[PDB]
Design a binder for this molecule. Structure first.
Ligand SMILES: CCCCCCCCCCCCCCCCCC(=O)OC[C@H](CO[C@@H]1O[C@H](CO[C@H]2O[C@H](CO)[C@H](O)[C@H](O)[C@H]2O)[C@H](O)[C@H](O)[C@H]1O)OC(=O)CCCCCCCCCCCCCCCCC
Ligand code: CLA
Ligand code: CLA
Ligand code: CLA
Ligand code: CLA
Ligand code: CLA
Ligand code: CLA
Ligand SMILES: CCCCCCCCCCCCCCCCCC(=O)OC[C@H](CO[C@@H]1O[C@H](CO)[C@H](O)[C@H](O)[C@H]1O)OC(=O)CCCCCCCCCCCCCCCCC
Ligand SMILES: CCCCCCCCCCCCCCCCCC(=O)OC[C@H](CO[C@@H]1O[C@H](CO)[C@H](O)[C@H](O)[C@H]1O)OC(=O)CCCCCCCCCCCCCCCCC
Ligand SMILES: CC1=C(/C=C/C(C)=C/C=C/C(C)=C/C=C/C=C(C)/C=C/C=C(C)/C=C/C2=C(C)CCCC2(C)C)C(C)(C)CCC1
Ligand code: SF4
Ligand code: SF4
Ligand code: SF4
Ligand SMILES: [Ca+2]
Lengths: 42, 97, 733, 80, 193, 154, 66
């Protein structure tokens, strides 16, 4: 548990989880505001 | 317009300037800059026989030291600007405001 | 001595084949020869310069003689646009009958080569008309090269050899080279253009036997001395003028028009005469700067030492630079190579946009060949400039004599320079590649409008400032009440604005987003090549991985496998690595130029404008598309005149590929293979009766890197030249 | 013949001597350190230029340096 | 002090005529540059103090502005005009070269001195009235001089940038259009168009 | 207009591209059941394509001779949405990332085994540190003014 | 009277052929012996390229820093 928490924070696993979260975020963002070549709000 | 008028006048003015106005300045600058040197010696003192200053023709009888090569330089300047004046005075060019 | 090579005792005692190899590859490194002094070094350099001059003159006269003998000149001057120029005849006993019939072009009586050097247009522009002219020229050049050899010999005995003191006289040499080598030469060329070429472009045939009988101007030399110089421009050639005929010709010898000749699409001859005259005047006046035996002028050393900024941001300024430049031959060579390379690529950029020779703008593949040739040469020269900078820093740099001047302060903050060069190249690479890949994906998914096209608005604005009127910016020279446009409106602006706003030439081609992307590829190439070279130069004297590199020389294998491994740690290895990037960047440059022009020459510029923004466009619409005739040079159904290129094209692919061997496989492998080969030879009957005299060894480490680089670059040059000449020559447009 | 030099930063560890394939180096008395020993190179005519000795030097920078030089058949390690 | 509450540069104590401790770029850090700087500042100030009356008073009279008054030369048959009279030696080249060698002679004569205080304050033939008799009335005259001169430099740079803002207009014309409607004819419309 | 380009909404090649694009998808919809899963998916992307073209038209993009929306980066205020405001957003996000990383590196530099906290992230410390990136611009400005952003001594 | 910096000090390196040149290290021991040309022994927090973290130096090569 403590050691599982440690292993889940080793560099490869920390980075894969981080990048999976980032990928999910970007994917959803472009799923809501697709085909965006500019910033049209202000 | 009269080319010879202008050439003689301009080179005479340049020579007057060189002998009576900028002489001392040019002399002190040529003194403080000195002879070119390689490795601390002048070019003649390093073994170059051809790089010896021509002390015979450089000495002159002018009260201040005006000699052949400086009349050459000043007069050539006078001629250059005289011909510039002639050429541009009859090129017929005109800009516009 | 007692063996080849004699300039080296350490190599002469080498019992292996290495002695031969290295014996050849260090022949001109005079500073590393046995019993070398400074006098020997300088005198050998002088003599070999004379030898190189002899080689150059022999080469150009070989060109002239062959064009005169087996050429096409007299027929070509009659109709420059509808006949192909011949370089020389072909005699190849390996040729077949259909090859003989296929190569007989240009109206010749046998197989010939078609010239793409552009010597026909050059010689036609300057005045040569008949074969007798070319024969006299070739004979004169043979004479000149013989005299060059005679001088090279004469200045090698005692009795005539100069002292090192003479070679280091910088002020007088600069005086002469500026005023005499550049000034009087340019003045004489203006004289030839005024006396021979300008009349030759109006019908008259001025030659040696009559040039004292012909006035170049109706009022010869009166205007010059009376001051009324304008009389030498009072009647230019009318704009409906056939080149070597008097139909529509004038009498002006000097002028400033700026446009092109309407028929030939090249610069006016009188404009070039005036240009050479003007720059001759400038060089002559500027060559009286430095002090010599006459007690006036400048002392370069004093000017250098006087340029030190108070506030000490530059340390000691340039104090001590005269002596480190005058005593270092590698510093001088690096400066010469740098300036020469920059002006070489300047030549390349100016010769395609402002052509000087008649009917060369309409010979497209001559244009392409000239551009690519000069750009590759400029790239090699730049790499050499940096290599000799590094060699200087190792061999001729003296730290204590250069205490705190600009050179030492360059050396002492090398980390900042290298890190920032690396940042710039990382930024450019990341973003240029990223934009290209984004576009490629956008077009793979079938959505053209989802691309990230950036308009090169700064270059378009500059083009507008020169007078182009296709982007509607209305700046200088494309304004209407500007001082710039009004001030030259009567001298050269008419012709200039007429030529720039014409869109059938190459003077300031229209640019779009593809031009933006490829220019940033160019910028990345330049920055990365300079990163490699500058890192090699500033790290030549030692780094943290090897602090004592300077006493190992310029080129060495490595520093063993210790401390993590030190493969390719020399500065020679940095040069070796930078040549790859030089080749790559010049490749990008020449690809860009060739594709833009090959689409402009077909009136299909939209093809480039649209397919240049993604790399599949470059692959398919440029490489795969323009390569059909070339690879069809010969096929199972016969061959045509392109076969020689189709062959060379594959040749360059082979060479390139074998260059990979020497670059990937390393020495140990080959050495052990060679040793078992030696066993095999010594152990076999009827052949152990024959014995080698040098023990066979695998190539050295540095030698192998050199051989692989040579193979790589030769293959590169050959395959690209084949493709370029075959793809432009096939369409001839 | 390659040229091997020993510099006075030598701590006389002798790891390099125990590393060389051709018995070029040696240990000799000295007084400049706590081992009273320093490395000598009396037989550099047998040095192959392998530079194992440099990878065994624990000093910084190295105290044993091999400068490759003119090649012999001994230097090139050729058995034919 | 040029800015109350700001420490002074060490090399600028306050004895020199006109020293108010202004040197944000620290250009006068090295004393032998500061000497030349004092000299050049005085020369500039004197030129501009002479120039600004010459820019203003002819336009105050019925003549063209300072830039209109120097544009006949841009036309081939250029002929000057002083007070409404065509000067005889009025063409461009005569004017140009007489001005050239006149100024060159006098300027060389000026920099052929190595006092270096008479370099800025030569006096003698240039002090007919002899206002340099009292060494402290002299000092406050020095202060008044460099003060008025800095003001005149300011006024001149203002004149020329106003000219670049309203091309073909004179400074008094600008004063006139400002007085015509002060609340609407100001720098505002040239800062925010 | 700028660089000779024309407003895509009024361009003809931009429209022609839109109609051509929309045309091919419609063909893919055919030869299947009118209300099938694949047909429904093709319809969805057709509407998506129409929305993208109308969105491009609405945002006032510049179209060349090929009808492709070119991007102006010179600084013209009619076009900041194309490069400059996205650029400011990027610089903000990248400064966030870099500042958080630098903050973390500085915080863990004081242990005996600092490499241990680099191959194995201290996630509690990292989560304490991540949100300082929000104010990273002010913090970095005041660190530069303080003189503590750049290491002296090097 | 001992020689060189005291034990445990913080000294800056001045030998430019050293990996830690212009860096800092902690003194471990300076032999009081004469006859030794490099008495100071310095330990660093970073290995060099040879994976070594201690080195001997002469008294002039080290310079006690703050
Ligand atoms: C709309 C208009 C109005 C806006 C008002 C906005 C206010 C700011 C936004 C949110 C405020 C509420 C945040 C959630 C509530 C509890 C936050 C908290 O106290 O949670 C605790 C932390 C404590 O912050 C600081 O934390 C620092 C470091 O402590 C620790 O920091 C880490 C915390 O895990 C690690 O434990 C690390 O080992 C340890 O150093 C400081 O040294 C201080 O202890 C402490 O001030 O706050 C934190 O940032 C928690 C993480 C979220 C911070 C959000 C900041 C704003 C964005
Ligand atoms: C197509 C081949 C290729 C490519 C892409 C590169 C690319 C690069 N070279 Mg290189 N080079 C090459 C061939 C190549 N080289 C060859 C044949 C030689 C001769 C041996 C050299 C010799 C050479 C030298 C000597 C140097 C470089 C340098 C560089 C870098 C320059 C900086 C830059 O442009 O930013 C980046 C450009 C890129 C193209 C990187 C794009 C890759 C992206 C980031 C992939 C993104 C990953 C993505 C998320 C998915 C990953 C997949 C997953 C499995 C992980 C760059 C990464 C210089 C350098 O180091 O710069 C400081 C350097 O000094 N090169
Ligand atoms: C005015 C130009 C110039 C001059 C005078 C020199 C002069 C010199 N160079 Mg240098 N150099 C130059 C330009 C020049 N270089 C350029 C442009 C480059 C970039 C390519 C270099 C890169 C360079 C390097 C990397 C080195 C030198 C070195 C040297 C020194 C010894 C050269 C030597 O003798 O090796 C012997 C000559 C050869 C080995 C040439 C034979 C092999 C060539 C390269 C192959 C030719 C290609 C092939 C035959 C043609 C294709 C075959 C066919 C199918 C068409 C010498 C003083 C060397 C040196 O010692 O530094 C001090 C050194 O290492 N140069
Ligand atoms: C007026 C006197 C004079 C003249 C004419 C020369 C002339 C020359 N000297 Mg010399 N020299 C002189 C005085 C003079 N020197 C003195 C007083 C000294 C004592 C200090 C020396 C010491 C000296 C040394 C040590 C050396 C020379 C060398 C040379 C040769 C230079 C190499 C070369 O030919 O490249 C040609 C250069 C040009 C043609 C001009 C440059 C053109 C530029 C680069 C570009 C042109 C662009 C244009 C478009 C070209 C058209 C192309 C198209 C036609 C195809 C050259 C012929 C070198 C040599 O001897 O080589 C054998 C050399 O080693 N000189
Ligand atoms: C180095 C280049 C060069 C050379 C060798 C010549 C040589 C010659 N020119 Mg020529 N010329 C040149 C450049 C040159 N020119 C250029 C650049 C122009 C364009 C302005 C002209 C325009 C020109 C004209 C219009 C004429 C000549 C003429 C002549 C011939 C008589 C010269 C004479 O005796 O006048 C007198 C020499 C002097 C008064 C001394 C000159 C002072 C020098 C600088 C010292 C002569 C063989 C004349 C001729 O009849 O051709 C056969 C003729 O009428 N030239
Ligand atoms: C296209 C590039 C290329 C070429 C031509 C070769 C060629 C060769 N490789 Mg190599 N290799 C390459 C790439 C290449 N390699 C690369 C990139 C690598 C890195 C992985 C390697 C790694 C490698 C290894 C590890 C080995 C080889 C070996 C060999 C040799 C195999 C024996 C043989 O085939 O005899 C015949 C020669 C040929 C087929 C070459 C073509 C012969 C031409 C067509 C004949 C023309 C003759 C002509 C008339 C000459 C006269 C011209 C005159 C003007 C002088 C051979 C010469 C092996 C070897 O050494 O063999 C014992 C070996 O072990 N290669
Ligand atoms: C830096 C000082 C300076 C300079 C460079 C000029 C320059 C000029 N002034 Mg000016 N002027 C000046 C100071 C100066 N002034 C001062 C201080 C006054 C007040 C007394 C005047 C009053 C004045 C008037 C009234 C006029 C000029 C005029 C002129 C122009 C023609 C002068 C001329 O005809 O030659 C010199 C004449 C002689 C030497 C006699 C000329 C560009 C004329 C003008 O405006 O041109 C249209 C003109 O009408 N000036
Ligand atoms: C998945 C959850 C793993 C939970 C875990 O490992 O902790 C629970 C323990 C680690 O926890 C340890 O437990 C020990 C006794 O088992 C002792 O009580 C230690 O004090 C305790 O720290 O590991 C496991 O029991 C999981 C075994 C593998 C399960 C898969
Ligand atoms: C918006 C884009 C521009 C922003 C400009 C911000 C101000 C930049 C100038 C001030 C920089 C600065 O103060 O630190 C300047 C920094 C060093 O910072 C200095 O550190 C000193 C010692 O700690 C003092 O604290 C000084 O107050 C501090 O300025 O170095 C430099 O940037 C060199 C420039 C001259 C200083
Ligand atoms: C390594 C080394 C070296 C080498 C180096 C090099 C190689 C360098 C270079 C460099 C380069 C290669 C450079 C270049 C340059 C250029 C420039 C810098 C430019 C320019 C210009 C300008 C400024 C312009 C202007 C103009 C005009 C005039 C008109 C029109 C407009 C314009 C703007 C265009 C040496 C030996 C020395 C030393 C040692 C180290
Ligand atoms: S170049 Fe060869 S010998 Fe040198 S370190 Fe690399 S692998 Fe070892
Ligand atoms: S190079 Fe090799 S053989 Fe020579 S001393 Fe070093 S380890 Fe021994
Ligand atoms: S390994 Fe280095 S320090 Fe140790 S004995 Fe050998 S040469 Fe001396
Ligand atoms: Ca054009």
């Amino acid at each position: 548990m403590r050691d599982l928490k440690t292993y889940l924070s080793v560099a490869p696993v920390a980075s894969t989880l981080w990048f999976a979260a980032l990928a999910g975020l970007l994917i959803e963002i472009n799923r809501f505001f697709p085909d965006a070549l500019t910033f049209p709000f202000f | 317009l009269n080319p010879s008028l202008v050439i003689s006048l301009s080179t005479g003015l340049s020579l007057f300037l060189g002998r009576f106005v900028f002489f001392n300045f040019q002399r002190e600058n040529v003194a403080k800059q000195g002879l070119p040197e390689q490795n601390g010696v002048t070019h003649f003192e390093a073994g170059d026989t051809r790089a010896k200053e021509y002390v015979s023709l450089l000495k002159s009888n002018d009260p201040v030291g005006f000699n052949i090569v400086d009349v050459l330089a000043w007069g050539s300047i006078g001629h250059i600007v005289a011909y510039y004046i002639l050429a541009t005075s009859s090129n017929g060019y005109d800009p516009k405001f | 001595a007692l063996r080849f090579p004699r300039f080296s005792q350490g190599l002469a005692q080498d019992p292996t084949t290495r002695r031969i190899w290295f014996g050849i590859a260090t022949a001109h490194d005079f500073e590393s020869h046995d019993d070398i002094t400074e006098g020997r070094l300088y005198q050998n350099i002088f003599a070999s310069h004379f030898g190189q001059l002899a080689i150059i003159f022999l080469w150009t006269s070989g060109n002239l003689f062959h064009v005169a003998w087996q050429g096409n000149f007299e027929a070509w001057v009659q109709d420059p646009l509808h006949v192909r120029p011949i370089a020389h005849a072909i005699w190849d006993p390996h040729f077949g009958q259909p090859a003989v019939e296929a190569f007989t072009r240009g109206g010749a009586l046998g197989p010939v080569n078609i010239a793409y050097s552009g010597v026909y247009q050059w010689w036609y522009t300057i005045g040569l008309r008949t074969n007798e002219d070319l024969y006299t020229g070739a004979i004169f050049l043979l004479f000149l090269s013989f005299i060059s050899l005679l001088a090279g010999w004469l200045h090698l005995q005692p009795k005539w050899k100069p002292s090192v003191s003479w070679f280091k006289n910088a002020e007088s040499r600069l005086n002469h080279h500026l005023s005499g080598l550049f000034g009087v030469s340019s003045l004489a060329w203006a004289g030839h253009l005024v006396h021979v070429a300008i009349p030759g472009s109006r019908g008259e045939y001025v030659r040696w036997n009559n040039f004292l009988s012909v006035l170049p101007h109706p009022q010869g030399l009166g205007p010059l001395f009376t001051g009324q110089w304008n009389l030498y421009a009072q009647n230019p050639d009318s704009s409906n003028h056939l080149f070597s005929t008097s139909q529509g010709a004038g009498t002006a010898i000097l002028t400033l028009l700026g446009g092109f000749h309407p028929q030939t699409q090249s610069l006016w001859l009188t404009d070039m005469a005036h240009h050479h005259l003007a720059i001759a005047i400038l060089f002559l006046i500027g060559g009286h700067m430095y002090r010599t035996n006459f007690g006036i002028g400048h002392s370069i050393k004093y000017i250098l030492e006087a340029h030190i900024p108070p506030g000490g941001r530059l340390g000691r300024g340039h104090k001590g630079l005269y002596d480190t430049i005058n005593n270092s031959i590698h510093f001088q060579l690096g400066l010469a190579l740098a300036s020469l390379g920059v002006i070489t690529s300047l030549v390349a950029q100016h010769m395609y946009s402002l052509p000087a020779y008649a009917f060369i703008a309409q010979d497209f593949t001559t244009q392409a060949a000239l551009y690519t040739h000069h750009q590759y040469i400029a790239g090699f020269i730049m790499t050499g400039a940096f290599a000799h900078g590094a060699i200087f820093f190792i061999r001729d740099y003296n730290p204590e004599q250069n205490a705190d001047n600009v050179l030492a302060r360059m050396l002492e903050h090398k980390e900042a320079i290298i890190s920032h060069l690396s940042w710039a190249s990382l930024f450019l690479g990341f973003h240029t590649l990223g934009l290209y890949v984004h576009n490629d994906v956008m077009l793979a998914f079938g959505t053209p409008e989802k691309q990230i096209l950036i308009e090169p608005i700064f270059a378009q604005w500059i083009q507008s400032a020169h007078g182009k009127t296709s982007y509607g910016f209305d700046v200088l020279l494309s304004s209407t009440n500007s001082p710039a446009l009004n001030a030259g409106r009567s001298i050269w602006l008419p012709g200039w604005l007429n030529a720039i706003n014409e869109n059938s030439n190459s003077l300031f081609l229209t640019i779009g987003p593809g031009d933006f992307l490829v220019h940033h590829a160019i910028a990345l190439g330049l920055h990365t090549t300079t990163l490699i070279l500058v890192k090699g130069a500033l790290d030549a004297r030692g780094s943290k991985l090897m602090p004592d590199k300077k006493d190992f020389g310029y080129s060495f294998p490595c520093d063993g496998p210790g401390r993590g491994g030190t493969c390719d740690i020399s500065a020679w290895d940095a040069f070796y690595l930078a040549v790859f990037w030089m080749l790559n960047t010049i490749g990008w440059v020449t690809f860009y130029w060739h594709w833009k022009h090959i689409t402009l020459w077909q009136g299909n510029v939209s093809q480039f404008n649209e397919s240049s923004t993604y790399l599949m466009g470059w692959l398919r619409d440029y490489l795969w598309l323009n390569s059909s005739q070339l690879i069809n040079g010969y096929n199972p159904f016969g061959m045509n005149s392109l076969s020689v290129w189709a062959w060379m094209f594959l040749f360059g692919h082979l060479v390139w590929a074998t260059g990979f061997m020497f670059l990937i496989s390393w020495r140990g492998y080959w050495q052990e293979l060679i040793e078992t080969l030696a066993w095999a030879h010594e152990r076999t009957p009827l052949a152990n009766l024959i014995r080698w005299r040098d023990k066979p060894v695998a190539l050295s480490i540095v030698q192998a890197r050199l051989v692989g680089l040579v193979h790589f670059s030769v293959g590169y040059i050959f395959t690209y030249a084949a493709f370029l000449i075959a793809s432009t020559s096939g369409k001839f447009g | 013949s390659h040229s091997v030099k020993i510099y006075d930063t030598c701590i006389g560890c002798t790891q390099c001597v125990r590393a060389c394939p051709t018995d070029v180096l040696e240990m000799i008395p000295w007084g400049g350190c706590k081992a009273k020993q320093i490395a000598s190179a009396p037989r550099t005519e047998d040095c192959v230029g392998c530079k194992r000795c440099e990878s065994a030097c624990p000093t910084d920078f190295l105290s044993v340096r091999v400068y490759l030089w003119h090649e012999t058949t001994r230097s090139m390690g050729l058995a034919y | 002090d040029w800015m109350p509450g700001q420490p002074r540069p060490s090399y600028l104590d306050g004895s020199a005529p006109g020293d108010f401790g202004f040197d944000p770029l620290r250009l006068g850090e090295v004393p032998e540059n500061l000497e030349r700087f004092k000299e050049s500042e005085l020369i500039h100030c004197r030129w501009a103090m002479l120039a600004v009356p010459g820019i203003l008073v002819p336009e105050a009279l019925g003549l063209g502005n300072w830039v209109k008054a120097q544009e006949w030369a841009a036309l081939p048959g250029g002929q000057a005009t002083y007070l409404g009279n065509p000067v005889p030696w009025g063409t461009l080249p005569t004017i140009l070269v007489i001005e050239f060698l006149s100024i060159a002679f006098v300027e060389h004569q000026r920099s052929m001195e190595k006092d270096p205080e008479k370099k800025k304050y030569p006096g003698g033939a240039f002090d007919p009235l002899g206002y340099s008799k009292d060494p402290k009335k002299f000092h406050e005259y020095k202060i008044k001089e460099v003060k008025n001169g800095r003001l005149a430099l300011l006024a001149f740079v203002g004149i020329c940038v106003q000219q670049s803002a309203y091309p073909g207009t004179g400074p008094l014309e600008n004063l006139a259009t400002h007085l015509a409607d002060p609340w609407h004819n100001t720098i505002g419309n040239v800062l925010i168009p | 207009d700028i660089a000779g380009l024309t407003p895509c909404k009024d361009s003809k090649q931009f429209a022609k591209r839109e109609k051509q694009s929309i045309k091919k998808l419609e063909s893919s919809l055919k030869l299947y059941a009118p209300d099938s899963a694949p047909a429904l998916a093709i319809n969805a992307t057709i509407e998506k394509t129409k929305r993208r073209f109308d969105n491009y038209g609405k945002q006032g993009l510049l179209c060349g001779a090929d009808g492709l929306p070119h991007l102006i980066v010179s600084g013209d205020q009619r076009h900041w949405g194309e490069f400059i405001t996205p650029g400011i957003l990027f610089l903000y996000i990248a400064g966030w990332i870099g500042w958080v990383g630098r903050s973390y590196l500085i915080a863990i530099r004081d242990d005996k085994k600092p490499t241990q906290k680099e191959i194995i992230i201290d996630v509690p410390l990292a989560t304490g540190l991540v949100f300082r990136g929000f104010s990273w611009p002010i913090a970095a400005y005041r660190e530069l003014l303080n003189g503590e952003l750049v290491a002296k001594d090097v | 009277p001992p020689i060189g910096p005291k034990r445990g000090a913080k000294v800056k390196i001045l030998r430019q052929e050293s990996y830690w040149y212009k860096g800092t290290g902690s003194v471990v021991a300076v032999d009081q012996d004469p006859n030794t040309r490099y008495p100071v022994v310095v330990r660093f927090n970073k290995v060099n390229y040879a994976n070594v973290s201690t080195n001997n130096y002469a008294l002039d090569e080290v310079e006690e820093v703050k």
